Design a protein around this nucleic acid. Structure first.
Lengths: 282, 187, 104, 341
RNA sequence: GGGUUAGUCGAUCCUAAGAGAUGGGGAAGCUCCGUUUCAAAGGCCUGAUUUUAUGCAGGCCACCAUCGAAAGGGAAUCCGGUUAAGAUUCCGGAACCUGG
């Protein structure tokens, strides 16, 4: 029974040391040496900035023409929604003038791009930095012009309420004010009385109802955006090493199939089934 | 051990003694980025493996077995060329647009004429570092030679600038010091 | 090869599908240490639905947490069961599984 | 000769030590002091051979990656044998009631992994197979509707099932996001997981074929999109024991959106009654008589519909019998439930 | 023809002067040198070595085959009886040693 206390202290000590040294090495050395950088990436990223900034410029032009309704010279008057499902079918449906639920998924962005400030502003107002963060959002017509801008960095789609249920009942943090803290702390979804404590005004109790009224959006959905404000997803592949590098290559081929980059400013919104996707990422 | 002792005593007795100038042209070799882009070139022109070959054979044979004789059309296979006598054979036509030459071969004398031979034939040779890296791009253990003749039109412009790059980086830099007796400095 | 993939697609289901159990034959193994789950018949002993006794665990909460983890966990097992509305979310349960695995 | 050092046995078997830890747990080989004859039994085993073959396979995968030849690595991965677990399951548990006796620990881990969120060390496919098999196990129970015992706790939900002999004591922790413990190592529980998964897999085969219906259970996809449960599965074709099976016969419930849907859903399925939850309704009420709800203020306050806090279901099945619902009416206080243990 | 019966008496085990394979090196070669020497010369401990989720990781120890004594070194048995011819070895009783 001595092995219990001994290895229990050892694993906690070595795990804290490993996490602290991993926190104190990664941002330290990559700014310490910081590199003998390269001569190629400095130019390829410059071309990638030219492309991405120009497509966001063309997006801003065409959306100002649609929004001010000074429209005489555009390609397409209405926007469109593309649907990638399974030699892979892509269904196109015209845009809906109706608010809806979406579960956006912050993807790792394309290869070597320095991203501008207009896209960074939209992503920062949507808390999508530090990728593998899919977050819930509202489809309207005024929130929609952001979706053309974030589309090369996120993926869009309709999730299922069973999958949304399993997301919320398995994952989720709450920034919380508690008994005695310095109070940057986040608790996972356990106490329904903590829920009704901060949400007794809106009358929101019993996180099953938070799932329900994220599904509903009839009374309050952005209150759930204030309360369940943080989100985290896992990295899908174990990564390095032979058995997982093949998996990385196959899934990069899958992502290169499923994501299409438009750069046309009449870019259709691309929806993928999040339901099979959360068999992977949750 | 003995073999560790000998493999450490090897390359000491070489550099201690005067090497003839037809050797030490090797290790006066290609630098980092140019060899990197050369490998990026030749991985575009990997030869077909035995598995991929047999797989395409089974595909077309099942096609003819149904029959379902689809068409009779294929442009050509393009690949690197790697047989040593075949590499020499592609010279003295000339057909070799680029030749990579491994520095390390244990019978060095298999190789020693090839820089002078591509010199007189005007073939843009380059001495590459490591025959294992040649074997990797040609699905062998080692290859020690790498000739490349046929190139698609998508890649032909990259080929010419790579040739000019090598002739700038190899033929200009190392030509006079190629004539000099290397080594001789004790260990 | 199309027929081969057709074969493999059926054989993947057919291999995992078939199974057979057999008849009564005991394994009289002296070295095998098969034990049932403890506290299986002690579920009324856990308070676990608005019951009184775990309030004593409120008195000995510092006594529980002051003890070793092998003594802390069983002592902190019973706790004040309020209602349906909250279940604290099972920090102890994974450690219990890992401890049982170490016992095996 | 009776005791063998783990280093000695692991070098005689020429296996890696972590895979020796796999094999000991895997065959039930028990003690760094191990029986010589048990290692002699272990000395020839094809799963050991396929483990060593997998080591050489990963070595060939490393040379495939280091040579950069992707397609040969694809050929290696596709043309790859998989070690199965099934033969030592049958020669470990020949008698099927011994598998029924030892399914009890096998359920519990797989339910806990079905609760567990997706991580890096535990794949989602692992969790997918866990949740699938656990939903299958629950869906089989709701066929014969045969448990008898219910337990409500801060630690788990302990149900034992009266099926073909012993009552089997499986537990499900509530579907809450759990802080992962850094203290544990998954490398053992994954071996237990895979062993129990294959074992319970073939036991589900004999229980589905013995119950006379198809061992793969079909589900409507849109029913799964409503709720990922046992009720997702449809169960095909090719009495009930009194009173607990078909307790609350012809009985229509209205579970709220407030209640925990899962274990109450499973209890009503153990009763055979129907489930109507408004949480299922907003995905997109004639016969409903009873509301299971735990709320202080009830809005529409239908006198025809009976308002009940859920312990009534937890107490009726622990008795097997009906009790009055005045205590279970909100907001009346409840008897401190001490389950029959 | 018959006769020599042992845990305890010896050999066996240890090393002595000395002999002598191996690693190596000489020699046209039969073979000669050399004996721990210019050798990768084995066998012990720990491991949820905590994540890469089906592949061994982290350490510890330090000289050397074998033969060579019925007088050197060395676990332990005595009395009495008995045979044509045997006995600290058989018979009767009484002891001890080693290993488990």
């Amino acid at each position: 029974x001595x092995x219990x206390x001994x290895x229990x202290x050892x694993x906690x000590x070595x795990x804290x040391x490993x996490x602290x040294x991993x926190x104190x090495x990664x941002x330290x050395x990559x700014x310490x040496x910081x590199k003998f950088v390269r001569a190629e990436s400095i130019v390829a990223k410059t071309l990638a900035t030219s492309r991405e900034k120009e497509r966001i410029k063309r997006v801003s032009i065409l959306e100002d023409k649609k929004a001010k309704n000074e429209t005489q010279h555009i390609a397409s008057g209405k926007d469109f929604i593309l649907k990638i499902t399974e030699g892979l079918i892509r269904e196109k449906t015209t845009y809906d003038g109706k608010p809806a639920l979406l579960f956006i998924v912050r993807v790792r962005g394309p290869l070597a791009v320095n991203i501008p400030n207009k896209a960074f502003k939209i992503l920062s107002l949507l808390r999508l930095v530090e990728t593998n963060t899919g977050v819930f959002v509202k489809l309207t017509k005024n929130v929609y012009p952001l979706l053309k801008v974030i589309a090369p960095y996120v993926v869009i789609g309709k999730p299922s309420l069973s999958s949304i249920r399993s997301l919320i009942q398995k994952r989720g943090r709450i920034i919380y004010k508690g008994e005695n803290e310095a109070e940057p702390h986040e608790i996972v979804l356990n106490d329904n009385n903590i829920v009704e404590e901060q949400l007794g005004d809106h009358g929101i109790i019993c996180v099953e109802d938070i799932i329900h009224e994220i599904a509903t959006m009839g009374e309050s959905f952005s209150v759930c955006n204030f309360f369940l404000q943080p989100f985290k997803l896992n990295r899908e592949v174990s990564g390095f090493g032979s058995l997982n590098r093949l998996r990385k290559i196959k899934q990069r081929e899958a992502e290169s199939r499923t994501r299409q980059f438009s750069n046309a400013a009449t870019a259709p919104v691309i929806e993928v089934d999040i339901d099979s996707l959360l068999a992977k990422l949750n | 051990p003995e073999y560790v002792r000998v493999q450490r005593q090897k390359k000491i007795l070489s550099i201690r003694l005067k090497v003839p100038p037809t050797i030490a042209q090797f290790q006066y070799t290609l630098d980092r980025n140019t060899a990197a882009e050369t490998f990026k070139l030749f991985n575009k022109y990997r030869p077909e493996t035995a598995a991929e070959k047999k797989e395409r054979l089974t595909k077309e044979a099942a096609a003819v077995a149904e029959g379902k004789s689809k068409q009779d059309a294929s442009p050509k296979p393009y690949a690197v060329k790697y047989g040593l006598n075949h590499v020499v054979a592609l010279i003295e036509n000339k057909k070799a647009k680029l030749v990579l030459i491994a520095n390390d071969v244990d019978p060095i004398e298999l190789v020693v004429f090839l820089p002078a031979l591509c010199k007189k034939m005007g073939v843009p040779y380059a001495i590459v570092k490591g025959k294992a890296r040649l074997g990797t791009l040609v699905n062998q253990k080692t290859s020690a030679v790498a000739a490349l003749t046929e190139v698609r039109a998508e890649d032909e412009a990259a080929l010419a600038k790579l040739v000019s790059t090598i002739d700038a980086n190899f033929a200009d830099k190392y030509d006079e010091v190629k004539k000099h007796w290397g080594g001789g400095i004790l260990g | 090869p199309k027929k081969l993939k057709e074969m493999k697609x059926x054989x993947x289901x057919x291999x995992x599908x078939x199974x057979x159990x057999x008849x009564x034959x005991x394994x009289x193994x002296x070295x095998x240490x098969x034990x049932x789950x403890x506290x299986x018949x002690x579920x009324x002993x856990x308070x676990x639905x608005x019951x009184x006794x775990x309030x004593x665990x409120x008195x000995x909460x510092x006594x529980x947490x002051x003890x070793x983890x092998x003594x802390x966990x069983x002592x902190x097992x019973x706790x004040x069961x309020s209602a349906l509305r909250k279940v604290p979310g099972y920090g102890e349960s994974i450690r219990e599984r890992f401890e049982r695995s170490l016992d095996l | 000769r009776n005791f063998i050092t783990r280093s000695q046995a692991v070098r005689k078997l020429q296996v890696s030590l972590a895979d020796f830890r796999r094999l000991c747990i895997f065959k039930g080989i028990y003690p760094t002091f191990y029986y010589a004859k048990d290692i002699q039994y272990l000395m020839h085993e094809p799963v050991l051979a396929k483990f060593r073959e997998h080591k050489t396979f990963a070595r060939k995968l490393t040379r495939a990656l280091g040579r950069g030849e992707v397609s040969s690595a694809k050929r290696l991965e596709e043309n790859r044998d998989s070690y199965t677990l099934d033969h030592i399951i049958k020669e470990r548990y020949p008698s099927f009631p011994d598998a029924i006796r030892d399914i009890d620990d096998a359920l519990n881990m797989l339910f806990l992994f079905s609760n567990l969120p997706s991580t890096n060390q535990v794949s989602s496919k692992i969790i997918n197979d866990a949740q699938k098999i656990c939903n299958q196990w629950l869906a089989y129970v709701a066929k014969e509707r045969l448990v008898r015992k219910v337990f409500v706790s801060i630690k788990g939900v302990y149900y034992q099932a009266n099926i073909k002999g012993e009552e089997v004591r499986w537990l499900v922790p509530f579907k809450f996001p759990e802080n992962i413990p850094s203290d544990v190592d998954f490398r053992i529980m994954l071996t237990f997981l895979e062993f129990y998964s294959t074992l319970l897999h073939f036991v589900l085969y004999k229980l589905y074929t013995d119950s006379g219906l198809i061992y793969p259970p079909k589900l409507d996809l849109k029913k799964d999109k409503i709720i990922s449960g046992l009720s997702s599965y449809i169960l095909e074709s090719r009495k009930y024991d009194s009173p607990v099976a078909s307790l609350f016969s012809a009985f229509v419930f209205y579970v709220s959106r407030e209640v925990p849907i899962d274990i109450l859903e499973f209890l009503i399925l153990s009763c055979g009654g129907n489930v109507i939850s408004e949480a299922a309704m907003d995905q997109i009420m004639s016969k409903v008589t009873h509301q299971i709800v735990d709320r202080p203020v009830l809005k529409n306050k239908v006198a025809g519909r009976t308002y009940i806090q859920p312990q009534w279901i937890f107490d009726c099945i622990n008795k097997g019998e009906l009790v009055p619902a005045n205590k279970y009416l909100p907001g009346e206080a409840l008897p401190p439930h001490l389950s029959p243990w």
